[PDB]
Amino acid sequence: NTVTFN
Amino acid sequence: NTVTFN
Amino acid sequence: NTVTFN
Amino acid sequence: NTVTFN
Amino acid sequence: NTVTFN
Amino acid sequence: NTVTFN
Amino acid sequence: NTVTFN
Amino acid sequence: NTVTFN
Amino acid sequence: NTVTFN
Amino acid sequence: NTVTFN
Amino acid sequence: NTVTFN
Amino acid sequence: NTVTFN
Amino acid sequence: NTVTFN
Amino acid sequence: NTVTFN
Amino acid sequence: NTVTFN
Amino acid sequence: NTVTFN
Amino acid sequence: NTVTFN
Amino acid sequence: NTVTFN
């Protein structure tokens, strides 16, 4: 599972 | 599962 | 499952 | 399942 | 299932 | 099932 | 699992 | 598992 | 496991 | 807007 | 907006 | 916005 | 925003 | 923002 | 932001 | 920010 | 920031 | 910052 906060 | 916050 | 917040 | 918020 | 908010 | 909000 | 805070 | 704080 | 604070 | 998939 | 996948 | 995958 | 994967 | 993977 | 992997 | 891997 | 690997 | 490897 992947999470990116931009 | 993938989540991207832009 | 995929979620993108733009 | 896919969700995109634009 | 797909959901797009524009 | 598909939903698009424009 | 991966998390990136930008 | 990987975490990057930018 | 890897953690980078930038 | 609201969507529910049952 | 709100989406729920059941 | 809110998404829940059940 | 909030996402929950169950 | 918040993500929870269950 | 918050992420929890369960 | 907070991450927890369980 | 905080990370916990369990 | 804080990291704990359990």
Side-chain angles (χ1 to χ4, degrees):
Chain A
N1 303 122
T2 308
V3 178
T4 307
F5 299 92
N6 302 125
Chain B
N1 303 122
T2 308
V3 178
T4 307
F5 299 92
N6 302 125
Chain C
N1 303 122
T2 308
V3 178
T4 307
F5 299 92
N6 302 125
Chain D
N1 303 122
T2 308
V3 178
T4 307
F5 299 92
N6 302 125
Chain E
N1 303 122
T2 308
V3 178
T4 307
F5 299 92
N6 302 125
Chain F
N1 303 122
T2 308
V3 178
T4 307
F5 299 92
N6 302 125
Chain G
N1 303 122
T2 308
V3 178
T4 307
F5 299 92
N6 302 125
Chain H
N1 303 122
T2 308
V3 178
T4 307
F5 299 92
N6 302 125
Chain I
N1 303 122
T2 308
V3 178
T4 307
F5 299 92
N6 302 125
Chain J
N1 300 303
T2 304
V3 180
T4 304
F5 299 92
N6 301 128
Chain K
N1 300 303
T2 304
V3 180
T4 304
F5 299 92
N6 301 128
Chain L
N1 300 303
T2 304
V3 180
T4 304
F5 299 92
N6 301 128
Chain M
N1 300 303
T2 304
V3 180
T4 304
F5 299 92
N6 301 128
Chain N
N1 300 303
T2 304
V3 180
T4 304
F5 299 92
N6 301 128
Chain O
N1 300 303
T2 304
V3 180
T4 304
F5 299 92
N6 301 128
Chain P
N1 300 303
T2 304
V3 180
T4 304
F5 299 92
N6 301 128
Chain Q
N1 300 303
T2 304
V3 180
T4 304
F5 299 92
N6 301 128
Chain R
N1 300 303
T2 304
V3 180
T4 304
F5 299 92
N6 301 128

